[PDB]
Design an enzyme around this catalytic site. Sequence first.
Site, short mmCIF file in Angstrom:
data_model
loop_
_atom_site.label_atom_id
_atom_site.label_comp_id
_atom_site.label_asym_id
_atom_site.label_seq_id
_atom_site.Cartn_x
_atom_site.Cartn_y
_atom_site.Cartn_z
N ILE A 198 0.09 0.27 4.18
CA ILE A 198 0.06 0.90 5.88
C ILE A 198 0.55 2.44 5.48
CG2 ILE A 198 1.75 1.36 7.64
CD1 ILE A 198 3.20 -1.09 6.62
N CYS A 199 -0.49 3.34 6.28
CA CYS A 199 -0.23 4.57 5.80
C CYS A 199 0.67 5.55 6.44
CB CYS A 199 -1.97 5.50 5.94
SG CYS A 199 -1.63 7.47 5.56
N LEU A 200 1.57 5.18 6.28
CA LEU A 200 3.12 5.84 7.03
C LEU A 200 3.83 7.16 6.32
CD1 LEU A 200 3.92 5.63 10.19
CD2 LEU A 200 4.98 3.95 8.84
#
Lengths: 70, 154
Positions: free
Chosen positions: B91-93
Amino acid sequence: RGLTKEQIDNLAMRSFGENDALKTCSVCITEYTEGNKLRKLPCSHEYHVHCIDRWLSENSTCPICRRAVL
Amino acid sequence: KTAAKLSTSAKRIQKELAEITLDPPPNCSAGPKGDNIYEWRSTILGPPGSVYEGGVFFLDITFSPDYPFKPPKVTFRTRIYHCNINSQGVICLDILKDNWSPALTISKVLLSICSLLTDCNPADPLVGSIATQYMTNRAEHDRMARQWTKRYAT
Ligand SMILES: [Zn+2]
Ligand SMILES: [Zn+2]
């Protein structure tokens, strides 16, 4: 990177007082108890000493507002 | 042995477990898989009104002994068509990388992930081709994301 031990010790430090009984250290999600020591940052957010010292050993900003501590 | 910051991490996870059971974020649950407090599983329902609506998505959550001074590792175990979540489930967060804060909680993480499902960030893509499609062929992107949600998440 985080803060030198000297910069960290230069931050404010006070003993628990009865008004702190109603407050919660955001890092350990625990209400202040007597005997605790609390550190208050320039942005005025407060933590257990051991709680924010641990964070400021490898980081440089306030856990809550992300403002630079220095 | 100072490995006693196991005590720090375990106390914090134990309190969060109680709080996330009594007050879970909307359409999410999470908890330990088994005896290891550091390894949780989570269910997220696709946000209503989004192309993920009606999906049921599973996440793995692993806390480190350094928690909460290092972010948990959170990966999607359900396939999802989303420019910030790749086929590894990464997840790109921001708050899972260098915007992590020790004042955050797993509940806050799950709320951000739901917010990311609702509004992806194609300026910071993990799946470039999906981001590009999202910005130039929005309708095609949404058609395929609904097909993925139906086939892979129901
Ligand atoms: Zn604390
Ligand atoms: Zn602050």
